[PDB]
Write a protein that binds this ligand. Sequence first.
Ligand SMILES: NS(=O)(=O)[C@@H]1O[C@H](CO)[C@H](O[C@H]2O[C@H](CO)[C@H](O)[C@H](O)[C@H]2O)[C@H](O)[C@H]1O
Ligand SMILES: [Zn+2]
Length: 257
Amino acid sequence: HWGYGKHNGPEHWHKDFPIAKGERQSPVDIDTHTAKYDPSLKPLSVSYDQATSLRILNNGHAFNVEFDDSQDKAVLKGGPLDGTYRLIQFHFHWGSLDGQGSEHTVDKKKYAAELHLVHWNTKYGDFGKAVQQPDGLAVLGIFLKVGSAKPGLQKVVDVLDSIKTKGKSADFTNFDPRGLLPESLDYWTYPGSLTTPPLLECVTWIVLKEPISVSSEQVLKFRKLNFNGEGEPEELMVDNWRPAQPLKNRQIKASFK
Ligand SMILES: NS(=O)(=O)[C@@H]1O[C@H](CO)[C@H](O[C@H]2O[C@H](CO)[C@H](O)[C@H](O)[C@H]2O)[C@H](O)[C@H]1O
Ligand SMILES: [Zn+2]
């Protein structure tokens, strides 16, 4: 099936997933000088106080930290969003080197990695139903650059030896995602899609202006992960990011001047 190499990567996806060339695909380049400040965007509201993490999983494309979304525990509201979006999982996209790895770009700048915190609109009852709606998902995108360590990431970095290969997972309870946020909640927002197949155009993207810093030793451990399953030839999990796609008939709004 699909992945990130020469033969199965982002240039091939359209063959099985023709929406890949669609109206509202992600990621995109964020041109800071074309984005329109919108004084009527409400403040963004991140409520991760009661967040219940369960498990970390290597799915052969990335690793997912999954949350209990059986009630309104950790939710995203405000900003450009209507109603409540429940957190289900976060994951990253990262590079083989520090100059690449993020999906969105800022004035063409690629960051070392990009965090995605994935939320579904509760008005739709479950995740499977929400992916089928234009306002079904809200994903909070946060850029990572390399510098000093993010202490709130270290617990994630430590568990990765135990989920090296596709299909492995470990228990991952009592992890707090507020430790992955920057100080500022300033953001750009546009309507878009999942950046992995099935590339469903159901996402309101909220991309934070301010990056988090991670140590070099922290990203190096991401890069020690494996695309392959146990006992297969080693393909390092690196460069699992889709490049930027045409903006087309869309506007990126900024929460800030
Ligand atoms: N990069 S992304 O956030 O657009 C992309 O979207 C999917 C999530 O909506 C995908 O999901 C993984 O976890 C979800 C949520 O439960 C699904 O169940 C799916 O089967 C699983 O792959 C990607 O992980 C993510 O890259
Ligand atoms: Zn993602």
